[PDB]
Every structure is written in C-alpha cells, then in structure tokens.
Amino acid sequence: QFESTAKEFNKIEMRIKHLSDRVDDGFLDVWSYNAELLVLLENERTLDFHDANVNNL
Amino acid sequence: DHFRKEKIIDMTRFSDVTTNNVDSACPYDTNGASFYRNLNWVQQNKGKQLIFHYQNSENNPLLIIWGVHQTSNAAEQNTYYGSQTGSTTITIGEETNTYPLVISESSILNGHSDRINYFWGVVNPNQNFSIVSTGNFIWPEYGYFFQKTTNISGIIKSSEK
Amino acid sequence: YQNSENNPLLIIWGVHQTSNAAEQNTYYGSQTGSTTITIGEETNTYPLVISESS
Ligand SMILES: *[C@@H]1O[C@H](CO)[C@@H](O[C@@H]2O[C@H](CO)[C@@H](O[C@@H]3O[C@H](CO[C@H]4O[C@H](CO)[C@@H](O)[C@H](O)[C@@H]4O)[C@@H](O)[C@H](O[C@H]4O[C@H](CO)[C@@H](O)[C@H](O)[C@@H]4O)[C@@H]3O)[C@H](O)[C@H]2NC(C)=O)[C@H](O)[C@H]1NC(C)=O
Numbered sequence: 096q097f098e099s100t101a102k103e104f105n106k107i108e109m110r111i112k113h114l115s116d117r118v119d120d121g122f123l124d125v126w127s128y129n130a131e132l133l134v135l136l137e138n139e140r141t142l143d144f145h146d147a148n149v150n151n152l
Numbered sequence: 153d154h155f156r157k158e159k160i161i162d163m164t165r166f167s168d169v170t171t172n173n174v175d176s177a178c179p180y181d182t183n184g185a186s187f188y189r190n191l192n193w194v195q196q197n198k199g200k201q202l203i204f205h206y207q208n209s210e211n212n213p214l215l216i217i218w219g220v221h222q223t224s225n226a227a228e229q230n231t232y233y234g235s236q237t238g239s240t241t242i243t244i245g246e247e248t249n250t251y252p253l254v255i256s257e258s259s260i261l262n263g264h265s266d267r268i269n270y271f272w273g274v275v276n277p278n279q280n281f282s283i284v285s286t287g288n289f290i291w292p293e294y295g296y297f298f299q300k301t302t303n304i305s306g307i308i309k310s311s312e313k
Numbered sequence: 314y315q316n317s318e319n320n321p322l323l324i325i326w327g328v329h330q331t332s333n334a335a336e337q338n339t340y341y342g343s344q345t346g347s348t349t350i351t352i353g354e355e356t357n358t359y360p361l362v363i364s365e366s367s
C-alpha cells in the first residue's frame with residue numbers, strides 16, 4: 096500500500112503518538128524476523144537445489 | 153491534484169469599520185508593518201454586527217482560514233474595536249462555530265500580550281458558509297480551491313533543496 | 314436514583330441552547346437554567362448558553 100509519513104499528533108496527545116510509535120515497532124519486528132528467516136531458509140534450499148541437479152546428472 | 157488561491161470576500165462591502173489592518177510583528181521583506189495576505193483584520197466594529205454569506209459554486213472544495221482576536225484588557229479591546237463586545241459565529245454547511253469575546257493577558261511574544269488564534273474549515277462544492285461578527289475577527293478574505301487525492305503522503309522535514 | 318438492577322443502565326439526556334433572551338424567556342421564564350448531572354463520582358455541569366445558530 097501507499098506509504099505515508101503523516102504520523103504527527105498534537106501536543107496533548109502524546110499517548111496517541113506512542114501508539115503510533117509502537118505500531119511501527121510491531122511491523123518492524125514482524126518484517127525483520129520474517130525477512131531474516133526467509134533468506135536463511137531459501138539459501139539452504141537453493142544450495143540443496145544445486146546439489147539435486149548435480150546428483151541428477 | 154489542484155490548488156488555487158482565490159478571493160472569496162469583498163471586504164469593501166462592510167461599512168463603518170476598518171479593513172486590511174496590519175502590525176509590525178509581520179513585516180514585509182523590507183521591514184515595517186504588514187499582515188497575512190489571505191487573512192483580513194477588521195477593527196473598530198464598535199459593537200455593530202456584520203453579516204456575510206457565500207456559496208461554493210466551484211467544482212472543488214474550498215479551504216478557508218480565519219482568526220479570532222483575544223485582547224489583553226478592556227483598554228486594548230476599546231482601542232481596537234471601540235466596544236467591550238465582539239463575537240463571531242461562522243457556519244460551514246451544518247456545523248456552527250462560535251467564538252465569544254475573550255479578554256485576558258498572555259505573556260508578551262513579538263511585542264504582543266494579546267493573541268490571534270487561527271482556525272480553518274472546508275466548504276464542499278455547492279455547500280455554503282456564513283459569518284456573523286460584532287468584532288475581534290480576522291476574515292478569510294482569500295481561500296484555496298483544492299482537489300483531494302486518495303494516497304496521503306505527509307511532510308518531509310529537511311533543509312535541502 | 315440508584316441502579317438496584319443486576320445490569321448497567323444507559324441514560325441519554327439533552328441540554329437546550331437557546332437563541333436569544335426572548336426565546337429563553339418564552340421557554341423557561343428566566344434568564345437562567347443550568348443542569349448538573351452526577352453519575353457515580355463524575356460530575357457533568359452544563360451552564361446556560363444563549364447564542365444564535367443557523
Ligand atoms: C496509490 O497507491 C497505490 C499503491 O502504490 C497505487 O496502486 C497501484 O497502481 C499500479 C498502477 O495503477 C498497480 O499496478 C498495476 O497492476 C495491474 C494488475 O496487476 C495484476 O494483474 C496482472 C495481470 O493483469 C499481473 O501481471 C500482476 O502481477 C498483478 O497480479 C497491472 O495490470 C498493471 O500493469 C501495468 O504495468 C505493466 C508493467 O509493469 C505494463 O506492462 C502494463 O501494460 C500496465 O501498464 C500494473 O502492474 C498496482 O497493483 C497498484 N497497487 C495497489 C496496492 O493499489 C495507486 O495507483 C496510487 N494512486 C495514484 C494516483 O498514484
């Protein structure tokens with residue numbers, strides 16, 4: 096989806112700003128963890144893919 | 153997708169009052185005393201009531217910005233407006249916004265113990281707005297016709313060009 | 314009033330904002346009229362407001 100930077104609340108709404116801050120923290124943790132293990136899993140499978148092709152010749 | 157300044161109110165049609173009032177807290181590039189281009193400061197209402205009506209016959213919503221003057225004391229209120237009154241009700245479509253007269257010192261900033269507080273609203277196409285004021289009002293002489301876009305971006309804070 | 318029921322009670326009220334002194338006088342016969350409604354320990358106070366609207 097279209098990414099936005101409008102994340103500002105007024106001076107007496109710091110709690111809403113904190114909610115916005117932790118919402119972005121949550122997605123940061125979700126994407127970081129999924130991205131790390133995606134690359135780790137696929138790299139192990141890619142090397143196995145080459146081994147299978149060599150064995151198949 | 154579109155953004156035009158236009159003139160929305162002919163300020164010359166209000167009688168027994170002064171318009172285009174200025175102040176040294178808002179100089180031009182030279183120096184001196186000026187004021188916001190789109191906002192017209194009206195003084196010396198003298199308790200008299202002013203009425204204005206408008207209809208957005210444009211095919212785009214209209215953004216208007218106004219201000220309400222909070223004076224420091226009875227003397228300052230008397231000098232600017234000549235009456236211990238001055239209250240504005242601005243109606244946009246079906247909302248009503250009422251700004252009763254408020255007199256109170258504040259700490260002095262830019263040589264001002266008084267304040268002008270700014271508000272805004274959106275007049276949709278074929279919708280109306282009206283102003284009833286007895287003083288202490290800064291009129292939305294100019295406004296911006298604009299076209300909304302769905303994807304919201306925000307503000308980039310940087311010193312770069 | 315005391316809610317002696319075994320369920321919470323939802324109540325809805327309204328506060329009248331009159332247009333002018335004449336309209337205030339016709340409806341209530343006095344240039345006053347203020348309501349304080351207390352629920353448990355909150356206090357809600359609605360002072361008289363007189364002002365035209367569209
Ligand atoms: C507000 O923000 C959103 C998000 O950024 C924007 O929405 C995106 O808009 C673009 C362009 O309008 C969309 O991309 C287009 O998707 C079409 C559908 O793709 C699916 O189906 C095709 C098969 O028909 C698959 O190949 C594809 O993988 C998808 O499964 C495509 O048909 C479009 O193809 C266009 O580009 C190719 C080259 O890349 C050309 O060859 C084509 O001829 C064609 O021109 C295109 O890919 C995108 O999907 C939208 N995303 C979302 C989340 O909405 C809004 O546009 C934006 N608003 C404004 C005003 O900018």
Ligand SMILES: *[C@@H]1O[C@H](CO)[C@@H](O[C@@H]2O[C@H](CO)[C@@H](O)[C@H](O)[C@H]2NC(C)=O)[C@H](O)[C@H]1NC(C)=O
Nearest residue numbers: 205206207208209245246278279280281282367
């Ligand atoms: C917005 O303002 C216009 C103009 O005052 C209102 O339309 C007019 O209504 C009178 C009757 O009171 C008619 O005689 C005019 O012919 C109307 N003018 C137009 C251009 O239609 C309109 O009703 C107002 N809108 C709302 C919601 O009050």
